Every structure is written in C-alpha cells, then in structure tokens.
Amino acid sequence: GLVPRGSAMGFDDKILLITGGTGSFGNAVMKRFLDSNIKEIRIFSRDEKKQDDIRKKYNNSKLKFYIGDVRDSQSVETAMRDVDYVFHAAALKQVPSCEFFPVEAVKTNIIGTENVLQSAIHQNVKKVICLSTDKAAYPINAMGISKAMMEKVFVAKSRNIRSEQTLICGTRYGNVMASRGSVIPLFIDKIKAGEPLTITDPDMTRFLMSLEDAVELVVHAFKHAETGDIMVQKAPSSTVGDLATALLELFEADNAIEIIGTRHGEKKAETLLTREEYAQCEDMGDYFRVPADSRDLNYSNYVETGNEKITQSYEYNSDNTHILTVEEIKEKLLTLEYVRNELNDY
Amino acid sequence: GLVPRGSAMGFDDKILLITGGTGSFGNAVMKRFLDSNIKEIRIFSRDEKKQDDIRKKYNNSKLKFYIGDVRDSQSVETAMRDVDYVFHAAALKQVPSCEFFPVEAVKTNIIGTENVLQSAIHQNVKKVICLSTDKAAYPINAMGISKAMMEKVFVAKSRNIRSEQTLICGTRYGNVMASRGSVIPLFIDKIKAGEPLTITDPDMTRFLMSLEDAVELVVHAFKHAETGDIMVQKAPSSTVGDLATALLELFEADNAIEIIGTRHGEKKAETLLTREEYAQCEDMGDYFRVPADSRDLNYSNYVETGNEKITQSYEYNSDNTHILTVEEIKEKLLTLEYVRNELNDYK
Amino acid sequence: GLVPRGSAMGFDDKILLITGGTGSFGNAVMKRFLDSNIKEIRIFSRDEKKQDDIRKKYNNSKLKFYIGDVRDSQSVETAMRDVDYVFHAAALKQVPSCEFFPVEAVKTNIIGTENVLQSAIHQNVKKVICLSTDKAAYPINAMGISKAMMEKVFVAKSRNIRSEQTLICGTRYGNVMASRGSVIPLFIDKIKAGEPLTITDPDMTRFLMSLEDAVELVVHAFKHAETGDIMVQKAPSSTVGDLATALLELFEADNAIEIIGTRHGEKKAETLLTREEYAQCEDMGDYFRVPADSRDLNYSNYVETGNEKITQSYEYNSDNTHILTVEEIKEKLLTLEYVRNELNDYK
Amino acid sequence: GLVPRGSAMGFDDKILLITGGTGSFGNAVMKRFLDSNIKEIRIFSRDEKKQDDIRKKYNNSKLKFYIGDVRDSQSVETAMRDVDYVFHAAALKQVPSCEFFPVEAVKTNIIGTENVLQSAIHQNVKKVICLSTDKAAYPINAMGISKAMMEKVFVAKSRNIRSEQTLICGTRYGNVMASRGSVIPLFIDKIKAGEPLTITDPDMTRFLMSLEDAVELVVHAFKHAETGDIMVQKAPSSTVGDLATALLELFEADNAIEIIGTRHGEKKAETLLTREEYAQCEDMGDYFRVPADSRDLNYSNYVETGNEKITQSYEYNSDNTHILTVEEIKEKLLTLEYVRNELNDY
Amino acid sequence: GLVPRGSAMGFDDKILLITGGTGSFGNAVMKRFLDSNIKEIRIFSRDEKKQDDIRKKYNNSKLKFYIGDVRDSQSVETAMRDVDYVFHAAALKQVPSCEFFPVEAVKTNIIGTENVLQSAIHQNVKKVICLSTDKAAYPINAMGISKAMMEKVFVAKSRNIRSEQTLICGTRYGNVMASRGSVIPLFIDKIKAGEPLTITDPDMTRFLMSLEDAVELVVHAFKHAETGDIMVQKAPSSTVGDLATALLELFEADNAIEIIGTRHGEKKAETLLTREEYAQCEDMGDYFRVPADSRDLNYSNYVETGNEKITQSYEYNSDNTHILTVEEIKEKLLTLEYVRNELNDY
Numbered sequence A, D, E: 001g002l003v004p005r006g007s008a009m010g011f012d013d014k015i016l017l018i019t020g021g022t023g024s025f026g027n028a029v030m031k032r033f034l035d036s037n038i039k040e041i042r043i044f045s046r047d048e049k050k051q052d053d054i055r056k057k058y059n060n061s062k063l064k065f066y067i068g069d070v071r072d073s074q075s076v077e078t079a080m081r082d083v084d085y086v087f088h089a090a091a092l093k094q095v096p097s098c099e100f101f102p103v104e105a106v107k108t109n110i111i112g113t114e115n116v117l118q119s120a121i122h123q124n125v126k127k128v129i130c131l132s133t134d135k136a137a138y139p140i141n142a143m144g145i146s147k148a149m150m151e152k153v154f155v156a157k158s159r160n161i162r163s164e165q166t167l168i169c170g171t172r173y174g175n176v177m178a179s180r181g182s183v184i185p186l187f188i189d190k191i192k193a194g195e196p197l198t199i200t201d202p203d204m205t206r207f208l209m210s211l212e213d214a215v216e217l218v219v220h221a222f223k224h225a226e227t228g229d230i231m232v233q234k235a236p237s238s239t240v241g242d243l244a245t246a247l248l249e250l251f252e253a254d255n256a257i258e259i260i261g262t263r264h265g266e267k268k269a270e271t272l273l274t275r276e277e278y279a280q281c282e283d284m285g286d287y288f289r290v291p292a293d294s295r296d297l298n299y300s301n302y303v304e305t306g307n308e309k310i311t312q313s314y315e316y317n318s319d320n321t322h323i324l325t326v327e328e329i330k331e332k333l334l335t336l337e338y339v340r341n342e343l344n345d346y
Numbered sequence B, C: 001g002l003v004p005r006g007s008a009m010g011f012d013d014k015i016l017l018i019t020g021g022t023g024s025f026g027n028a029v030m031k032r033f034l035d036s037n038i039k040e041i042r043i044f045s046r047d048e049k050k051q052d053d054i055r056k057k058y059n060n061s062k063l064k065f066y067i068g069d070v071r072d073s074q075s076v077e078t079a080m081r082d083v084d085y086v087f088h089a090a091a092l093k094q095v096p097s098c099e100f101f102p103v104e105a106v107k108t109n110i111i112g113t114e115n116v117l118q119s120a121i122h123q124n125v126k127k128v129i130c131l132s133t134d135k136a137a138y139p140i141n142a143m144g145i146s147k148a149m150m151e152k153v154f155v156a157k158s159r160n161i162r163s164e165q166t167l168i169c170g171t172r173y174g175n176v177m178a179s180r181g182s183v184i185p186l187f188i189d190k191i192k193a194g195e196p197l198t199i200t201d202p203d204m205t206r207f208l209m210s211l212e213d214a215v216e217l218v219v220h221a222f223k224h225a226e227t228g229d230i231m232v233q234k235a236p237s238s239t240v241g242d243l244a245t246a247l248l249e250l251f252e253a254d255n256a257i258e259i260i261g262t263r264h265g266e267k268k269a270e271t272l273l274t275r276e277e278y279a280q281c282e283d284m285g286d287y288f289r290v291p292a293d294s295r296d297l298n299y300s301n302y303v304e305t306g307n308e309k310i311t312q313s314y315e316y317n318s319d320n321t322h323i324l325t326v327e328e329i330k331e332k333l334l335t336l337e338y339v340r341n342e343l344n345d346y347k
C-alpha cells in the first residue's frame, strides 16, 4: 500500500510532482500512484513527445504535464507550487555521456537537485525523495561521483531544514533488471541472433532488483524515511557468468560465450552501503536506513571523537550478500514479464 | 630542476599564476619558482591580509598580488591575462566543512576549477596543473567527492581542447606530513603537554609525503605531464600506531595511547590509484602517469569493447605499498625541519 | 547535390553541428551528410539515450555525440569549437505544450537560438541554418509566435555581423507528411482499427511536404542562401477532406468520417510567405528567397519611404498554391515509404 | 468611475504601481487615479528626468517616484512591495527599433513582463493589467510578435495562479489618435508647412481610439476583467485616404496628396480579435472579453476535441468594423483637444 | 550589558549571525555575546581554517560554523534562516587591495551587503548592524568610497522596509588601536628592532578607539539604533608625531624619527561626521546618531526646500575633537593589554 499500516493518510487533496517523469522509473512510479486517490500527478520534464504519448496512453484526469528543466529554478518553481510530494528522478544517468560531459552531469544531477530542494523548501513541500544508484558508493565514474555528491547535497539540508517543514531523503539501488540497454536484453538479443554472448568479466557480481523492487523501495522511503535518510533495499546478487548461464538454459540456447574484458568505468563488484554507512544503519527488515549524522552541525564527530563500531564494520556489496545459484537466477528471471514474453516468442 | 634534463626553458618572459596562492601549498610552490628566472608570479586569492604579509616577507619584484575568487569568471579573467602557467591550488579542503556545506564545496572545487580552465583556454595559457588528493579515489566524503568530480572535469578538456593550445593535467597526493592541523603536530603537542595520544585506529595506514615531496610532484607534472594526465608520486606508508610509536621514541616520551575510534568521513587505508587507473598507468620511475582515455570521444571503450588487463589489475594503496618500520618512520620524520625544531626546542 | 553545380567543396576537413540532433529532422539531415566526405557530424542534445541508439545504429566514425542544451551558452560553446556549419533544429515545437508553457518556448526557441548564433559568431562558424515553420507567418499560437520571433532574431544579425564571418539564414516549411503524431499516421491508424476518421475542418488546407522535401530545402539554403535570407520551398497543398478521401481509397476502406470541429491553436489555411515577404522575395525556381531588408540599419524604409509593390502584393498560402486533387494526393502519398509499408502490411 | 456599480470598493489604503510610468499612457492613467482616494501611485521607470518633471508638475503627495527597470527582478521587487494593483505599461514599442534590436524587444516586452508578474505574485498583488496592441494579432513585425508572446506569457499564469491570489489580465488596443509621432500630427504639420501629405496606402484602415478611450479600456479591465482575460474596446475605423481628407477639410487646406507606398512592417488592415478569439469572446457591451482557455491544463482542446463554432467564426478587424465617413472622422477629430488647439492657432 | 536598561529582553531563544565572523572584530563581538544566554552564534565566512581554530579555541556549544560568501545570495540564505540579529562585518578592507581591485571591493562591500540585507529582510531578521569606517566620510580611496556607497545602500532600505519587519542600521568608527598591521605595532616593532620610527606626516591626526570601544559602539547600535541610523562614538584624537613620542617615552627608547611623507590614499585628518550629518545628528551622550532623512521618499528636501542649520554647521573630525597631549596618549595606550605585554617583555 502507499500508506503505513495504522496510518491516518488520505491522498484526496494531495499533489505529487515527478521530475524526470517521462523516464521509465518516473513512469512505473506514476502507475503506482494512479492506483490511489491522489488528486494530481505532475509529470515534469523537457520531453514534449514523451509527455504527449503518456497523456494519450493513460488518458487519466489525475495526470498533469509540465514542461520544464531541473536546471532552471524558475521552471521548477512553476511546477512546484502547491505540491505535497516530489519524487526527484531527473538525472543524466549514462556512464559514458557523463564521463565525456561531466560539467553536464554536475548541472543536471547536482545543481538540478539543489534547485528542486530549494524550491520544494520554498513551496512548503512535505517530502522529497531523491533517487541514487549503487554507482554512488566508492564511486569511480563521473556519473556515480555526481550522484554521490547529489546525496551529500540532499543530506546536508537535514542539518538545516525542519522535517515538519520539508522532509528530504533518498533511495539508492543498482541497475534494474531488463531495463533498456542493460545486460539481460543484450544477452537475450544475442541468443535470438545466434551470436555469442559478450561477457565483460564473468566473475563480476551485481545486485539483482526488478523494476517493481525499485518502485517498492521509493514507496518505502515515501512512507517511512525520516529527513536526511538514505534508504537501501536488501537484495541478492549474481555473477555475470551465472546470469549468462541462466539465460542460456532458459532459452535452451547453445551460444558460445566471448570474453570481451572489463570496460572503462566499471567495478568488479558494486557497493550498496560503504563501511561507515553500514556501521551506522538501522535494519528495518528488508531495508537498511542510513540516518544523517551530526544534524546539529557539530563538527567534533569528524575531528575529536571517533567510534570503534566504524573501525570494526564491513561494507555491504554484491560479493558479500547472498550470491544466487544459476537455478535461483532463472527463477528470479521468470518473475519478469519481459523475460517471459521474450521466452514465449522464442 | 624546473626543467627536464637536456631542455632549456627561458622562464624569463613567462608568467605563473597560483590560485590558492596564500595557502601553504601555493606558498611552497611560489618559493620554489622564486629561484628561477620567471618574470612574474601572480598570487591570486581573496585573502588581502595574507597577501600583504607574503608581500612584506619576500619583498621580491617577481611577486604580484591579485584579489579574486575562482568562483567568479571575470575575477579570474583579470588575473589570467598574459599568464603562461597556472598552478591551481584554490579549494575548500577540510572534510567536515565540505560535509556540512557541500554546495560550497561544488562552487569552489568544481565550478571554480571549470572557471579557471575556461579562462586559461580563452587567454591561451600553456599549462594548467590542478591539485587533487588521494581522498578523491573511491571517495567517501563530500570533500574527496568534489575533488574526484574536479578530476573528471579537467580530464574531460583533453577530449575537447588541443594540447599546444592549453595543456591541462593534475596531480594527486595524500596529506602532507606536518601540515597545519594534521596528526604529527597533534601528536607532538600531546607529547609536550604530557597528555595521552589520541589514536583513532592504530591499524590505519596513510601514505607519507613531505611538503617538499608534494612540491616535487607538482614540478614533475609541470615538466612532464601530457594533457589529460593525472600524475601521482610513488610513496611508502605507515600505520598510525607506528607513527605514534616513532614520535614517542624520538621525543623519549612516555605518554599513554588512548584509542578514540574511527571518526566520520575517514577510511582505514587511502587509495592513490584505483584499479582502472593502475591498469592503464605508465611507470615513470618514482611516479605513475594516468593518461586520459578516449581522446577522440569514442564511446566504445565504455560499451562494446573491454580490456582483460583492467580485469586482473588491483589498486595502489597505503596497505600495498611499502609500509615503513618504526625506525624507517623516525628516519623520515627527521628529514622535516618542523620535527627537528620541535625536538630541539624540547630540551 | 550537397554542392551547387560548377562548385567543389572539400567537406573533407569540415565539421557540421546539428542541434536538435536526435529529433527526426536532425536525423534525416545527418543521414544526408553521412554520404559526403564531411569530416565529422556532431550530434548535440541532452537525450543521452537516443544519442546512444543513433551511435549503435550507424556505427560511423564521422558521428560524435555531445551532451548539451541550447539554453546554456557554455554548453553550446563546448560543442561549437572548430565547427564549420550549424544546422539548428533544437526547438520546443508542440503547440499545446508551448501554449501552456510559453516561457519555456521563449527560453528554448528564442534565447536558445541567440546562444547558438552568438557562439557560432565567436567560433568563426561559416554558416548557421535555423529551422522554422509556416506556423511562424501571421502566427496565432505561442509556438508559431516564438518561431516568428526567432526569425526576427536570426535576421537581425545580418544587419550587424559580416557574411564572410558567419552566414546566418533560415528555412521555413510546414508539417512534414507522415511525421510522428501528424494526421496521416492518425488517419491510417483509424482505418486499420476500423474507427471513424476524425476530421477537424474538411476545408482546411495544409502545404504538403515530405521529409525528403524538407531535407532538400535545408540543403538548398546551405548551398545558396545569403546571410539574412529566409528560404521557402514552393509546394502544393490539399484540403483535409481530400487527404482523408485519398487514404480511404488507397486502403480500400469504408470507415465513416466524424467532424470534430476546429481545435484551439489552429488556422484554416497556412501561410508560407506574408504579403511583405512575397513582395520582396526572389524566385529561385522551386524556392523563394526572402532577402533581409535594410542591411545598413537605416530606419527610413520603416518611417519615411514606402513601396507601392508591397501595397498590391498578396500572400503565399495553402489556399492559393496548387491544391491537389484526390488522385494527385494519392500519387504523392505513394512516394512515401511509410505509406507503402502501411499499405503492404495491410493485406 | 474607478469602481464597478454597486461595488464595496475603497482606495484609501491601496497602492497602484505603474511601470513605464513616465510614458504618455502611464501618464494619463496616473491622472485618472489621482482623482480618487488611492493612497499612493508609484511611478516606476528608468527616466530620472521624466520623473522629476512629473513630480514638479503635479506636486501631489499621492505620487512616489521609483527608479527601476522591468528587466531586473530585484529592481521590480523593490517597487512591488505592498502594492495592490499594477498597470504594466513598460515596453519597447517602436516598430523599427524592435525590428533591428529584437533581442532588446524580448528582454523588455517578454522577459520584463514575466519579471513583473513573478514579482506581483510573490508580493500578493491583487491585479496586474498588461497592455498590448492590435499589432499583436496575426503579428508581422518584431514589436507586435514580442507583444503577442507577452500575451501568451500573462495568459499562461491563469492556468497556474489563483485569481484570489493575483489576477492577471491584459488589454489590447491600436495606436491612439494624436499620440506623438503618429499620423494625425504628421499630417497636421504637413498642412501647416504647406507641404503635401504623404500617404502610404489610402485604402489602409486603422481603428480610431482617443487616449481617453484607451484609458477607459484599462479602467474597464481593472474593474471587470477576470484572470487570464484579454479585454478589447469595440471601435470604429477609417481609411487613411479619408482621415487625410478630413484633416484637409477641417483646416480648409489645399495640400496635395503624395502616395509614398506601404512601408516595411505595416499591414493594410489591423486585427483586434483573431478568428479563434472572436469565436470564444463574450460581448460585454462596448468591450469584448477573451477568456483564457483550458485553465486546468487539459491538452485535449488542442488535440482530440475541436469546436465547429471556431470553424464558422470570422476575425474582428478595421475592415469589418464600422468604417467612418469623412464627416464622422471630422466629428471624432473635433473631440480631440489636440486637434482643436492646432485648428485654432491656424 | 547587551540589553537597554529597564528592557524586557532575553536571548534564550535568539540566533545571532556574524558575517566576516573570523576577522578580529567578528571575533571580539562573538566573545561579548558568548557571555549571554544567546542560543546560537553563527560564524559565517569562507575561511575553513580560521573557523576550525575558533571552534577548538572556544569549545562552546553556542557557536555554529557556516561556510559561505556574502557575494552569493544562496550561500547567505542558508546561514540566514531563523536568524534574529546580524552583525555584518564581512568586507574587503585594505586600502591598496581595494585601490588596485575596485571591482572586487564593490562585489564584497556593496553587492555583498545588499545580498545580506535582502536575505535578512526575506528571513524576517529583527536587526542588521552594518560596520563602516571613518574612511567613508568625504572618502578618497576605493576602500572608503565602497564603504560610503555601502552606507547609502543600507540607509536606502529605511526609506522602504518597516522597522518592525527588519531594522537596518550601521556604525562608523576609525581604525582600532593595535589592530594587526596598524601603526602602534609597527612603531613598537621599530622600537624593539632599534630602527627609526617611520612617520608619514607628524601633523596627521587620527581618532583613537580601542577594540573594546569599537565593540561597545556595535552593542550600543544593537540596543538603541533605530532603522536607517548611522551611529558614531565620540572619541578623542592625536597627531601621529605625538603617538610616536608617547610610545618612545613609554618604552624609554632613543630611536630617531624618519619622515617618509604622506602615502597614496591617506588624508591629513579623518572625518567622522560630514557637515550634513553633524547638522542633523542627535547627541545621545557618548554617541551621535545620524537619522535617515526623507523616509517617505519625498524628494523636496533635495530640490525645493533647504535648511539654514546645514548652512551653519561644521563637520566632526580628528582636528576639531579633543586632541590628546602626549601624557594622555600614554595613559590611553596603557589601557591596551597589547601595549602592556609588549612593554613588559621589553
């Protein structure tokens, strides 16, 4: 549900703004809230085409289409007036595009976020949920470094704005299974083309999250996050070599593997909580919550006083979570209707 | 050597601009270049008071004092006209203050650097060297993250602007030994006051670099870096417990150790080259050079083509260099005039 | 012909920048210039995903993919360095979305164009061709008004900057046949689904232009426009009722027609040249050239001196060109591969 | 009067801001409100001279002189604090000056307006009345195109701001008779110089409005416009050939006519309501009101659903209004004290 | 005390912001308020070092350290939220640095001040006290001219903002005795080096103010200034030749004097109140208060109506105040612990 258990919450008079609202996450979130009594869902983005396709597709009076840009504070102000909740998903998110145009990454992902937070604070928005990526933890590419910096920026407001004025929090998850351009559809197309599957490093591990998992994470933060939190879903992982086997077997395919080597900007394993975060997080069940530290702007935690619990802690990553067997991966894959439709047609 | 063996530069008609000029780094680089034939060293910062002290202290006709702020392009442009070389050291560099004010860290360390680079390109500057830190590699704190992003910003120029137009490169090094506020003067003060030494985690390792090491790394980049390069100096490391022991012994002191635990914003070990950087780097001897990849803006190294050499590389860090022994740390500590003076003053 | 008969251009050392590069117009111009000796075609937009699809689809070394936004001058300047030719197609071009967000239409279509022009002048670009629409002539909707104002902005340069510095011109054409979201694919879908064809006003006339027509108009301007020129392609028109009949017949289909009435934001007939433009234009054959007036900034053509030729001119519009017959419309519709494929797939 | 009939309106505690307040319309509006109990009339403009001449001329404690620029939002904010009503008349309004410097036209007429609207909304201004021109309908020159765009910008706020917060509307009229530089004083001076009257196109028609007519239009909008309205005064027209005859006869002059031809940037006839506007306007008597459409940002009126009433409608212009005879034009001319003083001295 | 006599004032829930808070005045003001029940003292400046030294030095939970820049309105907004009082001391204040970089002087001293005032007005700050210098009266160098302009800017808000919203006032004093770089420590070091004292012009007069005097002036304005006031402390002066004698005698030193001549950018005498200010000030005892004129923006005081009291008035400067004898100067010097410690060690 969209409401905590035993909660006195009604959406009848509320307005949700989604930035990046035409992207595929913005889109699944929109569908989740359309099934609610929310008054208005504002879809905010520069893409007049995407907006018109959605408008015609859903034909739903809850949906409002705003043209604007997170880089421009006046364009954000216009869509922010009267809004109660913001799911901030606008971002430059491709690794190579950010690597070659990092100033562009900073204007959208960092300054764009700060525009949206300042405007939500000015308009008395109740909640802002910022989206981030496991590429933000111990980051190595311009994309993940811009998102790690975006986290620092949204966290820093909790050392400055009253939760009862505007609650600001964020969610961090890995690439979603079967998202466009990702390795599941790459492999599947290779299978169907009778071409070899190109594996970078078969011993790489990545967390496995469906789109539905990633939408539930955003809804969990929307319901339970306190201001300054970063919220992560616990998730299993697999090696890429095993994901490939799994897809081979499901499609009963005989395609060879071709090892192409690790690409620029990629880790062997992804981290979801650094050592410090893991040391300080609270376990909410299927989620970890990382509370903002030093909300009173006391510096001494950084300088004079330390914690032997940080000294003793480990980081949370795709090598030390539950690494799925080949049969577990097939099972998880069969929960994805994307995989199922492709499996049928084959 | 401000110049490669077998080279001559006239610096005689050249102009060096140092941002961050009044800080202790700009200051040691400044002093290095005063002993050259350089025509003019422009000290650029907003600290009018420190500028006046440096002016009075050195009393040297080569030095010019410019007021201005890397956050303001017109302020930089005023100081950049006719400059040949820029050492870009302006930064917000404390961890806690970047953590709490990260928009200010982006404004000075990222947007400020881009202002300096765009103006240096506009004014036909020959080289810009950007200073960075080992806290930028696999960064955890807002400060190291902002410096990581600055590195991506200065490297991205080498895939747009042409080396014989403006060579743009950077150096990355760890905390300098005996710097203002760092653990060596902390520990020495604790000794002298007869108080216990507050150790966070005795098994932490940190690269050991003197100020003169760091100044040599900048000069090595100035002479030898190509556009897009990140230059690092190979360095030994020590554990924090052995650094305490070494000082305790040099000072013949018996203060207790008190373990206060790991502070927020800090790692067990520092990384100087990530796995991908190590795999791609060139060994210059006592230095590694990380060349910029994909100078022609081709995306296929990121998407379709990979490299097995990245796959079986690992990272260069303060646990896998040479970790000094207690007696090696004392030998290094004794090379520092700060340590000698403290020790002398101690009887 | 990317070059006038009796000319040679080496494009071999030349660089073309397309703003709006990922849209369907930039895409067809791009494909046109891939078959030339052009050194590099830079696709400029903020759509990182569409850029990656184009990159993978074409796999052509001439293509470079730049992230950036016509609203940001430094973003444009990065992509404009060393460019020889700019096709400026970036725009907000839907009517309802410019109507409801007209400040966004001004930011992208007017201020965005001025950013592109100032940077092209700064970087010594040889030509910029700006794309415009017949909704800009006697405009009624925020979209056509913003494009009318963009035309005034690019024409006003020719009364300031010098042709052998940067030639600046534009093309104006109507909706392209079978474009995304346009009435032809609407009607074909309605046929295939066995639903009635929703006609607004059957007596509306619109100029008929294919995508290849439109691409030829841009190439005609690139070869032949002078600075300040607005170029238009002469074109026939049809009424909307005959376009429906033509499709109904090609598809041997019997769907009813439903009249829904004129929508907000639309005219009965489109204008391609106003009265003043017609009076002043040169006939190039299948094209009209509208020269920029008063290149020396003299005001007297506006105040003290008039022209009897403007007085007895009229306007070039979709009612006074050649209005195609049903059978002529079917002949034109059959030249489009989109229509052929739809028709083929239909049995 | 300044107050609707039967209305409970008092100006005792209200503040009016006029931008472009030193221009000749700003000036007649000022004189109209000086005859009221308004507390303060702020005259806002860059022209320190014009302001000091007015200050000395009127010597009236209601008048306050602010220096500022509609292009600068901070300069507008300073004059906007505590204001109840704004008559926004600042503009670049010469045809050739806008044609040659259209970026200048956009910064004053379009962005300048958006600065004034955002600031009036921030300061809780009750009413903003924007002035526009018949050159804005089916516009052909940079000046009228910038004003047509300005209309779209002020209308668009009614799809976003509550009338009870800030009512935003606009008025559209043609050139005013006997305004400086206009054809009535040009002709009259030709008469007095014994030179031929230079007529562009004798068959051109233009609406005839006195300055007093144009001030009554602004007051009518101030009293009755709802948010998003464009308000036009019904007005007769004349051919230029007939205006010239009329002036010739009134002055009993024998001057020849010289035909100089249509100039750049001029239409044969002016439009006051386009076809779409005319189809949707309400007739208030001597005025038409064009209501803002789609205030709920429903797109479908643009895309899926049409109106056969638009299909059937005609536009409202100076050829299809009442075209005055030569005797009617003389009569109207004799109501203008400008014409009378010139007639006497002659 | 920090509270007027008989005043109902409590600092328990109040927040003070100090810009330029790491400079030596910002620092003495901070120490004064630390001795009070104020809830928070925010130290605002770009100098992360200075801030950390203070934090460690005082180790006091009242102190909060903000990084920011008066030149950036968003950086000021962050530190201004929830603030009750601002002591605005950020400035470029060296004569030669402003002379050579006057654009820099204008961005910090003039535009920086206007950022801080606009933000204090937006955040409903109760009081802003701006600091200025006697070099601002009849100014001759870029530094004093930028500060004279800063005074005009803060005064001008009182012709526009209600005191009950935000009271804006300023204090004007000369260089403080024994401040860093000033002539007392220069001379003293000359004495101790056995070098000649370099005197510019022995007949120059300057007002003598201790740091404690200058802090009491700021506290007096904080307690009693009304909006638009400039507040000056009455102060005696000395000739430089006499200051030098005094120091010579106190240290029983035989150093010669060397006359170096007047330097660029220096007056013979400093003015604290111009003629106009002196004519209009109220004498509060040990302070003069200069009230803002024409708070209703009536121009006529400038143009049509004059005051024979201005015609008759004199200016208040270091030649017409009480010029101290050599023995008086020694006495005043001995109240400065700086002088005392130096005297001892010698």
Ligand SMILES: CC(=O)N[C@H]1[C@@H](OP(=O)(O)OP(=O)(O)OC[C@H]2O[C@@H](n3ccc(=O)[nH]c3=O)[C@H](O)[C@@H]2O)O[C@H](CN=[N+]=N)[C@@H](O)[C@@H]1O
Residues within 6 Å of the ligand: A093, A094, A095, A096, A175, A176, A179, A180, A181, A182, A183, A184, A186, A198, A199, A200, A201, A204, A205, A206, A240, A263, A266, B302, B303
């Ligand atoms: C374009 C690019 O270089 N990488 C975009 C992409 O992020 P990335 O982490 O590469 O995800 P993927 O699903 O491709 O690889 C997963 C695993 O399979 C491996 N992999 C991948 C491709 C391949 O051919 N073979 C292979 O083994 C690969 O090494 C890894 O171990 O998609 C992201 C998010 N997509 N969404 N939403 C964007 O942020 C990025 O810009």
Ligand SMILES: CC(=O)N[C@H]1[C@@H](OP(=O)(O)OP(=O)(O)OC[C@H]2O[C@@H](n3ccc(=O)[nH]c3=O)[C@H](O)[C@@H]2O)O[C@H](CN=[N+]=N)[C@@H](O)[C@@H]1O
Residues within 6 Å of the ligand: A302, A303, B093, B094, B095, B096, B175, B176, B179, B180, B181, B182, B183, B184, B186, B198, B199, B200, B201, B204, B205, B206, B240, B266
């Ligand atoms: C303020 C702060 O949090 N750290 C500033 C500082 O970065 P940092 O890495 O802390 O260097 P240090 O010299 O303090 O620690 C070395 C080792 O001693 C250990 N350490 C440190 C302090 C102590 O009391 N005990 C202790 O064991 C400690 O855990 C570590 O393992 O110095 C940087 C460079 N400039 N200087 N100095 C600034 O960028 C930073 O803001």
Ligand SMILES: CC(=O)N[C@H]1[C@@H](OP(=O)(O)OP(=O)(O)OC[C@H]2O[C@@H](n3ccc(=O)[nH]c3=O)[C@H](O)[C@@H]2O)O[C@H](CN=[N+]=N)[C@@H](O)[C@@H]1O
Residues within 6 Å of the ligand: C093, C094, C095, C096, C175, C176, C179, C180, C181, C182, C183, C184, C186, C198, C199, C200, C201, C204, C205, C206, C240, C266, D302, D303
């Ligand atoms: C969204 C919208 O309102 N109109 C977009 C569109 O501009 P437009 O002029 O509508 O072109 P079209 O191809 O729809 O109509 C042709 C004729 O068919 C008639 N028409 C149209 C639709 C219909 O259902 N019935 C009908 O008779 C119609 O009245 C007309 O007489 O296409 C433009 C260019 N890009 N495309 N496609 C975008 O700039 C616009 O935002």
Ligand SMILES: CC(=O)N[C@H]1[C@@H](OP(=O)(O)OP(=O)(O)OC[C@H]2O[C@@H](n3ccc(=O)[nH]c3=O)[C@H](O)[C@@H]2O)O[C@H](CN=[N+]=N)[C@@H](O)[C@@H]1O
Residues within 6 Å of the ligand: C302, C303, D093, D094, D095, D096, D175, D176, D179, D180, D181, D182, D183, D184, D186, D198, D199, D200, D201, D204, D205, D206, D240, D263, D266
């Ligand atoms: C400077 C310029 O080119 N035109 C300014 C002007 O707008 P415009 O519409 O020309 O009004 P006018 O009163 O001149 O012509 C009326 C009729 O008489 C005709 N006309 C005019 C001059 C002439 O010599 N002969 C003639 O027949 C003319 O063709 C037309 O049919 O004044 C406007 C508003 N003025 N006010 N307030 C400004 O917006 C413009 O910048």
Ligand SMILES: CC(=O)N[C@H]1[C@@H](OP(=O)(O)OP(=O)(O)OC[C@H]2O[C@@H](n3ccc(=O)[nH]c3=O)[C@H](O)[C@@H]2O)O[C@H](CN=[N+]=N)[C@@H](O)[C@@H]1O
Residues within 6 Å of the ligand: E093, E094, E095, E096, E175, E176, E179, E180, E181, E182, E183, E184, E186, E198, E199, E200, E201, E204, E205, E206, E240, E263, E266
């Ligand atoms: C750097 C510079 O040129 N002047 C800074 C300085 O302001 P200023 O008024 O010079 O004060 P000082 O204490 O030096 O002279 C007092 C008298 O002694 C005389 N004087 C001074 C020096 C000397 O060698 N001999 C001498 O006779 C001198 O002529 C004068 O009659 O300190 C100021 C504030 N400092 N604080 N806080 C800054 O605003 C300025 O930038």
Ligand code: NA
Residues within 6 Å of the ligand: A153, A156, A157, B100, B101, B102, B103, B104
């Ligand atoms: Na922040």
Ligand code: NA
Residues within 6 Å of the ligand: C100, C101, C102, C103, C104, D153, D156, D157
């Ligand atoms: Na708008």
